[PDB]
Design a protein around this ligand. Structure first.
Ligand SMILES: O=[N+]([O-])c1ccc2c(ccn2-c2ccc(O[C@H]3O[C@H](CO)[C@@H](O)[C@H](O)[C@@H]3O)cc2)c1
Length: 158
């Protein structure tokens, strides 16, 4: 089991950490959601699906910078939503193919009532998402740590 990113970096067997750079909607209104879709950013596969089934969770999602200060919301993992920043580990998604498969995570972030002007700064860290991988074969339990950076400013109109 290993993963790769839309920025051309990787995390091999055994886990590790990578950076992800996301283009964000430039304007988000109070009462609306900023969508941060990681399924177009992070892709993983199973290295021996003939005999092994891989299990993958979002172990913890943490907010930083302008997301931490100016937004609330949810994380959608494989069709179900949970609070973000996270308060538990999600259920598992099965990886059962060598073919790249997106990691089905997206953040839905809404501005807090006090937000206005530049709410997320270009280049800044917005989230850290920990992917936990196990299997039905051995006792491997690996963390793939994804540091999510904004590529651009996000403005919340007054
Ligand atoms: O039954 N056999 O004959 C048999 C069984 C296993 C075999 C082979 C040949 C290679 N392997 C093998 C390949 C990869 C492997 O672990 C990595 O990939 C797993 C699947 O993605 C993942 O769960 C692990 O955490 C680790 O990332 C573990 C074993 C033959």
């Amino acid at each position: 089991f290993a993963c790769k990113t839309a920025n051309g970096t990787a995390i091999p067997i055994g886990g590790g950490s990578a950076n992800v750079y996301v283009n964000l909607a430039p304007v988000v209104n109070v009462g609306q959601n900023l969508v941060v879709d990681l399924s177009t950013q992070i892709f993983c596969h199973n290295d021996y699906p003939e005999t092994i089934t891989d299990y993958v969770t979002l172990q913890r999602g943490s907010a930083y910078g302008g997301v931490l200060s100016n937004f609330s919301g949810t994380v959608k993992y494989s069709g179900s939503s949970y609070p973000f920043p996270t308060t538990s580990e999600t259920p598992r998604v099965v990886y059962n193919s060598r073919t790249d498969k997106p990691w089905p995570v997206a953040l839905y972030l809404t501005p807090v009532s006090s937000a206005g002007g530049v709410a997320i700064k270009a280049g800044s860290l917005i989230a850290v998402l920990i992917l936990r991988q196990t299997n039905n074969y051995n006792s491997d339990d690996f963390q793939f740590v994804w540091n999510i950076y904004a590529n651009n400013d996000v403005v919340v109109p007054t």
